[PDB]
Amino acid sequence: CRKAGVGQSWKENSPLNVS
């Protein structure tokens, strides 16, 4: 997908932290 490759199994909780 856009933020992760798989879906939502990566680091999660917004695209970084600050923005």
Swiss-Prot record:
Annotated source species: Homo sapiens (Human)
Membership in a protein family: Belongs to the tissue factor family.
Assembly: Interacts with HSPE; the interaction, inhibited by heparin, promotes the generation of activated factor X and activates coagulation in the presence of activated factor VII.
Protein name per the record: Tissue factor
Stated role: Initiates blood coagulation by forming a complex with circulating factor VII or VIIa. The [TF:VIIa] complex activates factors IX or X by specific limited proteolysis. TF plays a role in normal hemostasis by initiating the cell-surface assembly and propagation of the coagulation protease cascade.
Lipidation (S-palmitoyl cysteine): C1
Span covered, complete protein: 277 to 295 of 295
Superkingdom of the organism of origin: Eukaryota
Induction and repression of expression: TF expression is highly dependent upon cell type. TF can also be induced by the inflammatory mediators interleukin 1 and TNF-alpha, as well as by endotoxin, to appear on monocytes and vascular endothelial cells as a component of cellular immune response.
Tissue specificity field: Lung, placenta and pancreas.
Topological region Cytoplasmic: 1-19
